[PDB]
Design a protein around this ligand. Sequence first.
Ligand SMILES: [Mg+2]
Ligand SMILES: [Mg+2]
Ligand SMILES: [Mg+2]
Ligand SMILES: [Mg+2]
Ligand SMILES: [Mg+2]
Ligand SMILES: [Mg+2]
Lengths: 241, 244
Amino acid sequence: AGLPYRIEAALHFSNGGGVYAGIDTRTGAQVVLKEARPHAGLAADGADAVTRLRHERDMLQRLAGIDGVPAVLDHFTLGEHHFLVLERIEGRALNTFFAEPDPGKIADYTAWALRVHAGVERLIDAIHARGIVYNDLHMFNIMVRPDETVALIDFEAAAPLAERSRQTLANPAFQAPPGRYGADVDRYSLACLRLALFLPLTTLLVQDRHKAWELAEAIAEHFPVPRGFLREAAREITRDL
Amino acid sequence: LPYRIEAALHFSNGGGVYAGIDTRTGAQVVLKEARPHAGLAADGADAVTRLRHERDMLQRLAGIDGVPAVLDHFTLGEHHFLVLERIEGRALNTFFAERHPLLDEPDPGKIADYTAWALRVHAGVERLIDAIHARGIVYNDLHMFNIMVRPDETVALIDFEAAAPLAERSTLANPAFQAPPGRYGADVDRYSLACLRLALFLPLTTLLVQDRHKAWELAEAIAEHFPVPRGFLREAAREITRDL
Ligand SMILES: [Mg+2]
Ligand SMILES: [Mg+2]
Ligand SMILES: [Mg+2]
Ligand SMILES: [Mg+2]
Ligand SMILES: [Mg+2]
Ligand SMILES: [Mg+2]
């Protein structure tokens, strides 16, 4: 083999790109391995797995040193098979918390959720300081570590802040806003996350972006959130509606 | 809504997947969601487009055991929802972390128990794939992440976005080996099944590092550790390298 890594689990695979959990045999350290195979011909399927893997590695290298961004440990190619070795971030993805009344526990949850958004906002701001927009911020990309700190997992969608593209990625909770660019895309996603951290999954999917103000008011009646916090999110969500 | 969402499974290309329950019957369901203009790919297919194509494929394959049934689909404003039956069981890729490394000086009884299990599983996938081809559909994306092993040991496939009519002439890469150049029709899925025959017995590290030129060597190495009928492995090595 000639490989210092041993793959122990297969996590997911899509569009010719696989993600695996492994071990550096030289040190026993836990790693994540992302692999990609080239795809030739037809530009209408745009960008193969190797192109997207190279872009993710570039974004991760521009964001190096930021806590909450996985470090690039290694990268190599076996023929045309590209390998990307990342650090393994421990913890749970934020979407797995939505699957699982005591007034003490309501208040304990409210503080917990605000600390998560606040850590995500601080992480997102550090990323903007490097000149990068994250673009794909939502509950499936947010990792909650055991010490309650946060991290982001997939950086394929990130792009330089300079790059002014009207293309804007849609949120699981609300429709994507039309003409936002730069850090305003991440500004919009963070606003949606402030509502989403308190809405039930069923309500999250059904309710449209026009009902944001009503949703903020409903949250403020059930949770001890400072009321302006929720209203600013509803304002940011409806700034163009 | 007659459905209550209990878990958020994944989100990609503007489309979310959720596990839920029909409140009228308590049945376990899967809910896939899409909003227009979301997930806009370079071919112009947005998330609603892929959801409609997946529903079409699942409706062409209705009644086939191993293909999830379409339970419901509706639109709230412009919000498209697709309700599918929940396939019980485990994804085949989750066995490579437990029903694999323990077979390093291995128990020969457990080696044989895994070998029989793997050949049963692979045979069920072939039977399902044949039913799908008889229905006029190519699956295109057959690999260990799309295969469900149900509690009674029968198999199923989960994701049908990549499926297409046998006619559609215009190949997706496999997790173990590169996709072959000029294959079309049912030969695409025939190649995926060949790769699956090796992948069920190779360790994950060897699977990813070794290329399809080494198929014959891999088949020989499998036969030294596992009591696999050698013709099973030889047909896979031939199908994988038939164009080299
Ligand atoms: Mg909306
Ligand atoms: Mg909604
Ligand atoms: Mg379910
Ligand atoms: Mg069906
Ligand atoms: Mg390989
Ligand atoms: Mg190959």
